[PDB]
Design a protein around this ligand. Structure first.
Ligand SMILES: O=c1ccn([C@@H]2O[C@H](COP(=O)(O)OP(=O)(O)O)[C@@H](O)[C@H]2O)c(=O)[nH]1
Ligand SMILES: O=c1ccn([C@@H]2O[C@H](COP(=O)(O)OP(=O)(O)O)[C@@H](O)[C@H]2O)c(=O)[nH]1
Ligand SMILES: O=c1ccn([C@@H]2O[C@H](COP(=O)(O)OP(=O)(O)O)[C@@H](O)[C@H]2O)c(=O)[nH]1
Ligand SMILES: O=c1ccn([C@@H]2O[C@H](COP(=O)(O)OP(=O)(O)O)[C@@H](O)[C@H]2O)c(=O)[nH]1
Lengths: 311, 312, 311, 312
C-alpha cells in the first residue's frame, strides 16, 4: 500500500545551496505525481539557515515542515528528530548540500512499488581518502560478515523507509544509533540500486577528524560486541608468549648460569608479561559481560522471523 | 500429566541428510502413537534448505511447521524462536545432522511419564578433541560446583522441557542465553539417561573455533558471575605475594648490601608486582558491580518454589 | 493499625532443633494473643527437613505454611521468598536454630504498637572472632556514615517489618540484597531494643569462609558505590608519587651523573609507575560510571520525604 | 507569560543565619509585588533546623512550605525534591547561608519577563582556592567546548527555571544529576547576569574535599562521556610512541651492539610500553561501551525542539 510520501532532509549551515535544493526537490516530487511532504531539520545552524526555514514555512502551497533544534545533536540525531514528526509513509532521507542528486527520488519510490521494505543506493564513482576507502572496504566486509548479508554503501544516506520500520526504530531504547544499519536490522525485504554521485559544489565538508572518528566509532559499536572478544584473544596471545619466554629462560637457567650477563631480572621480567597477559584476559572477561549488558539494555529483538508455514 | 507432544529441531544448511532425518523422525513419532507435531527452524541457511522446508510443508497430512528466519542468529536463538510457536507439552530438542539418534525420542517421552520436568541425555562414548574433552570435564565440574547438582553433559542438545518451564524461559528478558543451563536452573524434577552417539556422516559440524569460544564464553556468563570474584582472589594472592617479597628483599638489603650488584632493581620490581596485584583488585571490584548489573538487567527470578503447601 | 501477624523463618538442615523451635514459637505467639501465622522456608536442605516441613503441614490447627525451594539460593533469598507469600502484616524474621530467643517476639510486637515501621534488635553479649568483631565495628561506622543514622547490629536477623515496606522491597529490581539494610533505607520510623543472645546448641555454623566473604561483600556492594572512588584516589596517590620520583631523579641527573650506578633504568622506571598511576585513574573513571549505572539500574528512590507542611 | 512564582531553597544545618534569610527573602518577595511562595528543603540537618522550619510553618500568612527528608541525600537531590512539590512557574534556587544575596531575586524575575527559559547568574569577584579557580576555568572551557555555548559559572546555585523545563527534569530517570548543567542541556532560551558575592558570614561551607571531588566527578559524568574517548586517544598515543621507540632501538641494535652494555632491557621496556598502550586501548573500548550503557539507561531524549513550525 502507498499513500502520502514524506522526504526528511537534515541541514547544518547549508543555506548557500538551500534554495536550489528546495526547487529541485519540489520539481522532482511534482514530477513523481504522488502527494508529497518535505521536512527539513536544522541542527542548530550558526548562520541564517533557520531564517530560510521560516521563509520557506511562510511561502504558501509549500509542503515544507520547518523544524529547528536547540543544539547541534549530530546528523543521525537530526534524521531521528525528523523521524519523530513523520506523516504518511515511504520516508525519504536525503543529503543536505546536494551530494546526492534529488532527481533520483521517484526511481526509489518506483522501486518502493516493488514491495521492498528498505531501499538503498549503491552511490557509484564514490571518491574519498584512500585510507578511508580501505576503512570503508574493511568495515563493509565486517558488516556483511556480522549481518550475514552484503549491503553496498553504508556511508550513503540516500535511503527509503516504510512507516512500520520507522515506528519500530522510534520504539527502540537505543541512543546514538546509525540509521541505515539499524533499518537493515529491522528489514523483511531490502534492495539497493546504483545512483550517480556528485561532489559538493557551494558547501564544504562538515565532518572534521573528531567527527569522522565519532561517526565510524559509533557505527562499529552499534554493529556488534565482537571487538571486546578481540581484547581477550590478544590477552591470551600475550599470556602464552610470556609463558613460552618463562619456560625458555628456565631452560637457559638449566644451561650456562649467566645468560646475556645477569638474566636474573629476565626470570621475573618474563612473568611480568605473564601478569600483563592475565590482566588483559581479565579485561576480556569484563568486556564480554559489558557486551552482554549492552545487548540486554538495547532491547534488541532475539529472532526476527522472516516467514512461518502451517500444514 | 502428558498430552499432545511437539518436537523442535534447528537446521542450518543440513539439506544433504535432511529427508532421511524427516523420514526417521516421522517413523519414530508414529511408533510413539501419541499425537505429535514437528517444528523445523531455519537459521537463514545459504543453500536450498528453506526450499525443502516448504516442500515438506506442501506434503499432505504433515505435522511439520516450517519457520524461516531473516538471518543466521545462532543455534540457541533458533531453539528459543521455535519455543515461541510451540504447541502441547514436553518439548524435545533434536539435531539437524542425525548426530543424536532420533529413534530415542519415545524413551525420553517414556521417562516423561515418570514425572521429571527436565529429561537430559548422557552422551556415551562421545569423541572430540582431547583438549575439548578436558574443557568439557572442567566446565562440568564448575557447573556441578555452582549448581550443587551434577549433570552429565551440558553440550548435548537432546533434552526434554515441559510447557511451564518453556513458558518460564519465554518470560525472561535474557538475550544470548544457554537453553539447557537455564532450564536446569529453572527445574523442579530433573533426570538424565544414556543414549548412543553417531557421527555427522554426510553433514559437517558448523561450530568453528571462534564459534566454540563464543558458545563456551556464553555458557560461563549465563551460568554464574563467579569468575570476576576469582579474578579478585587471584589479584589478592599476587598482591600479598609481592608485599611479602618486598619486605623480604628490604630485610636482606638491611642485613647486607654487597651480596649482589643490582638487587636495588629487585625491590623496584618487588613493589610493581604489588601494584599489578592492586590493579587486579580493581578489576575484581569493577567486575562485581558489572555482575550486579547483569543480575539486575536479566531480571532473573531470585527464588523458584520446588513445592508449596498451604496447611488447613 | 494491627491485624494478622506472620512470622517468616528460614531453615537450612536445622531439623535437629526444629521441633523445639516450633513448640517455643507456637507458645510465644499463643501468649501474644493476636491471631498468628508461621512460614518456614527450606533452602534445599539435604537431610529430612522437608519431611518435617510436610509433617508440620499435615498437623491440623497449625498456622505453619510449609514452603520448600528447588535450590540453595542463599539465606537472604530465602527470607525474600518467604516475603513473597506473606499474609496479614508485621512480618517477623527469625533465625532457624534458636540463636535468637523466640520468646522475645511479643516485645517487638508490643513496640510495633508504638508506631515504628522498623523494629530491630541490639543483640547484646554478641561473641565472634576478634577480627570479625573489628570488621563489624568498622562496617557499622561505615554504614552509619553513609546512611547518616546509626543502627546497632547489622548481622542480627531478628527484625520486624510492616506490610507497606515489605511490598516496597518486593517491588524493587535489586537482586542479592541485604534485607535489614534495605529495610532501613525504606524506613519512616525505625527503632532498636536490646535482646538476649544464646549460642547455637544442637546446630553448627552454616557460614563457611567463602559464605562469609560472599555475605559481607554483598553487604558492602549493596551499601554504596563509594569504594570505586577509593580506587581513583589511590591511583591519584600513586601517580603523584611517580611524578615526585621522576622530578627527584631529574634533580639527581642535574647532580652527579651516575646515581646508584646507572639510574637511567630508574629514570624510565619512575615513568613506568606514572603510567601505572594513569591506568589506575582510568580504572577510577570507569568505576564511577559503573557506579552510576548500578545506581540507576537499582531504581533506588532519589529522596524519601519524611514529612511536608502546608501553610 | 509569567504567573505565580515560587522560590526553592535547600538547607543543611544553617539555622544560625536562617531567620535573617527568611526575613530578607520575605522582604524581597513583598517588594516584587507578584504572588509568591517559599519552599525550604531540609536535608536531615543534625541541629534544630527542622524545628525552625516548623516554627515558620505555624507563623500566620506564611508562604513557606516546609519539607523534611529522612536523611542527608545531598544538595542536588534536595533541590530536585523541592522541584517535586513546586507550584506556579519561574522556579528560583537560592542558598541557605546568604552567600548569594537574595535581594537580587526580582532582577532574575525581571529578566524572566524578557522570555529566557533559563536565567543564570555570573558570580562576579568570586574568591576561592587558586587551584579550585583553575579547576573551575578548565571545567568551564570543557563544558563550553562540549555544549558549543559558553556559560559563566556552573557552580552558582542561583538560577531560574520555567515550569516546562522543570517538568522535563522531573520526567528523567537520571539519579545523581547536576541541575544547572541538565537545565542548560534542556534549554530553549538561556541568559546570564552578574550578581554581587558575599561570604558565608556566621555559617560555614559544608562542601569538604571529598564532597568537592564527588560533586565535580558528578558534573563531569552528567555532562558528557568524552573522557573515556580521551583515555582511548591517550592509549593510542602511548602505543604508537612505544612501537616507534621499539623499532628505533632494534635499528640501533642492528647498527651496533657494543654501544651499551644493557640496551636489551631497553627493547624489553619498549615492548611493555606498547602493552601498556594496548591496555589503555582496552580501557577505551570498555569505557565507550559503558558510555552507551549510561546514555541508554539515563533515557535522555536524543533531540529537543527549539521551535517547530507547521506551514499551512
Ligand atoms: O553535525 C552535523 C554535521 C553534518 N550534518 C549534516 O550532514 C551533511 C553533510 O553533507 P555531506 O555528506 O555532503 O558532507 P561530506 O560527507 O561530503 O563531508 C550536512 O549538510 C548536514 O545536513 C548534520 O546534520 N549535523
Ligand atoms: O550457526 C549455526 C550453526 C549450527 N546450528 C545448529 O547447530 C547444529 C550443530 O550440529 P552439530 O552438533 O553436528 O555440530 P557440533 O556442535 O558437533 O559442532 C546444526 O546442525 C544446526 O542445527 C545453528 O543453528 N546455527
Ligand atoms: O545457605 C544458607 C545458610 C544459612 N541459612 C540460614 O542461616 C541460619 C544460620 O543460623 P545462625 O545465624 O545461628 O548461624 P551462625 O551465624 O551462628 O553461623 C541457618 O539456620 C539457616 O536458616 C540459609 O537459609 N541458607
Ligand atoms: O550535604 C549537604 C551540604 C550542603 N547542602 C546545601 O548546599 C549549601 C552549600 O553552601 P555554600 O555554597 O555556602 O557552600 P559551598 O558550596 O561554598 O562549599 C548549604 O547551605 C546547603 O543548603 C546540602 O543540601 N547538603
Amino acid at each position: 500500500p502507498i499513500k502520502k510520501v514524506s522526504v526528511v532532509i537534515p541541514v547544518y549551515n547549508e543555506q548557500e545551496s538551500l534554495p536550489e535544493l528546495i526547487r529541485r526537490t519540489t520539481t522532482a516530487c511534482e514530477s513523481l505525481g504522488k502527494a508529497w511532504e518535505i521536512l527539513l531539520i536544522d541542527d542548530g545552524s550558526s548562520d541564517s539557515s533557520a531564517e530560510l526555514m521560516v521563509k520557506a514555512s511562510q511561502e504558501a502551497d509549500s509542503h515544507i515542515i520547518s523544524i529547528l533544534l536547540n543544539r547541534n545533536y549530530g546528523q543521525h540525531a537530526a534524521i531521528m528528530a525528523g523521524f519523530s514528526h513523520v506523516s504518511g509513509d515511504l520516508i525519504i532521507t536525503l543529503d543536505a548540500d546536494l551530494q546526492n542528486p534529488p532527481e533520483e527520488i521517484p526511481r526509489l519510490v518506483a522501486k518502493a512499488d516493488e514491495g521492498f521494505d528498505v531501499v538503498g543506493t549503491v552511490r557509484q564513482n564514490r571518491q574519498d581518502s584512500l585510507f578511508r576507502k580501505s576503512a570503508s572496504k574493511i568495515i563493509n566486509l565486517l558488516i556483511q560478515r556480522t549481518t550475514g548479508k552484503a549491503m553496498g554503501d553504508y556511508g550513503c544516506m540516500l535511503r527509503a523507509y516504510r512507516r512500520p520500520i520507522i515506528d519500530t526504530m522510534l520504539r527502540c531504547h537505543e541512543r546514538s544509533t546509525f540509521i541505515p544499519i539499524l533499518a537493515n536490522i529491522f528489514a523483511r525485504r531490502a534492495t539497493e540500486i546504483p545512483v550517480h554521485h556528485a561532489e559538493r559544489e557551494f558547501g564544504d565538508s562538515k565532518y572534521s577528524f573528531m567527527r569522522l572518528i565519532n561517526l565510524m566509532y559509533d557505527l562499529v559499536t552499534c554493529l556488534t560486541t565482537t571487538p571486546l572478544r578481540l581484547l581477550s584473544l590478544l590477552g591470551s596471545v600475550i599470556a602464552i608468549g610470556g609463558f613460552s619466554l618463562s619456560v625458555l629462560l628456565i631452560v637457559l637457567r638449566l644451561a650456562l648460569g649467566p645468560q646475556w650477563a645477569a638474566e636474573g631480572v629476565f626470570m621475573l621480567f618474563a612473568v611480568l608479561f605473564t601478569f600483563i597477559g592475565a590482566q588483559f584476559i581479565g579485561m576480556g572477561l569484563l568486556g564480554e559481560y559489558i557486551g552482554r549488558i549492552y545487548n540486554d539494555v538495547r532491547a534488541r529483538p532475539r529472532y526476527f522471523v522472516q516467514q512461518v508455514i502451517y500444514p
